[PDB]
Structure 1
Amino acid sequence: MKGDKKVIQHLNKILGNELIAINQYFLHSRMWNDWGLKRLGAHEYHESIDEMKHADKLIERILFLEGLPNLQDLGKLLIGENTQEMLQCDLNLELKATKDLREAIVHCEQVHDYVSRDLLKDILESEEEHIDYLETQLGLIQKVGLENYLQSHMH
């Protein structure tokens, strides 16, 4: 079904953000696992899987709308060097992601692509849940101290 060209461009921009997030979260996960922080490793793994599922739905929607999904261009990974920085890098990426998602919904609404809007709204709900998780972790570090925070994410 021939989709709106700018919708397809917005979907490819969202897709591009998810592809960054897939790799950043996967690498952060395996770093935390290598350091023995396996509760962080596992949670971050599940965050990377969630982004994979979002990218899948985006690819499927783009193809249905008769566009070409861009899996070639990978933007800049934000990789931290310690736990606090890694959480903050994930948070910075998610804040960029939700900004782009909102702008994409505005345009879907304007050209009456209500099904694409519903898909992006669902993704936005998942990203806002990730932001909640990230902000909460960063706050816990301040409340319990870094050493306790890390201790609590070993097992």
Structure 2
Amino acid sequence: KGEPKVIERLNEALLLELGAVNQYWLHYRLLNDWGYTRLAKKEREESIEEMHHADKLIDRIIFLEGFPNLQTVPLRIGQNVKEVLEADLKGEYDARASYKESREICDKLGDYVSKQLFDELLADEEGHIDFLETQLDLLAKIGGERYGQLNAAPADEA
């Protein structure tokens, strides 16, 4: 049986990951319908990565004899490519902060395996952040139109 405080931090992470799943998937479908099929494929992949994170969190909570809360998911959606990237980045920044605090809480309470899980999430999060910051830097340098064109497919593909 796990610490109530640790289970609570795991559920907070689960809430964020479920929100990230929905936001990334909505962005995938919006981007696809706008014609940015290449970037859309990446957002789909990012959504599926957050799905695996939520699964690991659920698995850990059950092992600790807690109750995973999937009953709740706030979503930030953009109207253009730049706002989609910035919304994803904002969510990753919020997740990183939550996991950094959760890591310390698990460390102080002696739940080192749960600490290890948050460390893994932290490493994954900054990998996400590095990619998104790079894409936003590229968009700023070549312009949103050229960034959109680069991430759109020609009419005869697929």
Equivalent residue number for residue 128 of structure 2:
130
Report Cα offsets for 1:106-135 as digits up to 9, x if no partner: 000001111111111111111111111111
Q: How many Å separate the matches in 2 of 1:147 and 1:79? A: 19
- Computed over aligned residues only, the root mean square deviation of the Cα atoms, in angstroms, reads 0.7
SS at match of 1:79: coil
Runs (4+) of structure 1 exceeding 2 A deviation are none
Q: How many Å separate the matches in 1 of 2:78 and 2:146? A: 20
Corresponding letter in the other structure for 1:12: N
Report Cα offsets for 1:56-83 as digits up to 9, x if no partner: 0000000000000000012x10111111
Q: Percent identity?
A: 52
Equivalent residue number for residue 113 of structure 2:
115
The yes-or-no answer on 1:9 pairing with 2:14 is no
Q: How many Å separate the matches in 1 of 2:95 and 2:22? A: 15
Give TM-score scaled by structure 2 length: 0.95
Q: Is the 8 A contact 2:99 2:122 kept in 1?
A: yes
Q: How many Å separate the matches in 2 of 1:103 and 1:91? A: 19
Shift of 1:14: 0.4
Corresponding letter in the other structure for 1:72: Q
Corresponding letter in the other structure for 1:122: E
Corresponding letter in the other structure for 1:119: L
The yes-or-no answer on 1:22 pairing with 2:21 is yes
Query: Please, which runs of 5 or more residues in structure 2 have no aligned partner?
Result: 154-158
Report Cα offsets for 1:87-120 as digits up to 9, x if no partner: 1111111111000000000000001111111111
Q: How many Å separate the matches in 1 of 2:90 and 2:76? A: 8
SS at match of 2:79: coil
Q: How many Å separate the matches in 2 of 1:127 and 1:13? A: 15
Shift of 1:5: 0.5
SS at match of 1:109: helix
Query: Please, which runs of 5 or more residues in structure 1 have no aligned partner?
Result: none
Equivalent residue number for residue 38 of structure 2:
39
Give TM-score scaled by structure 1 length: 0.97
Equivalent residue number for residue 62 of structure 2:
63
Q: How many Å separate the matches in 2 of 1:88 and 1:99? A: 17
Corresponding letter in the other structure for 1:13: E
Q: Is the 8 A contact 2:81 2:144 kept in 1?
A: no
Number of positions where the alignment pairs a residue of Structure 1 with one of Structure 2: 153
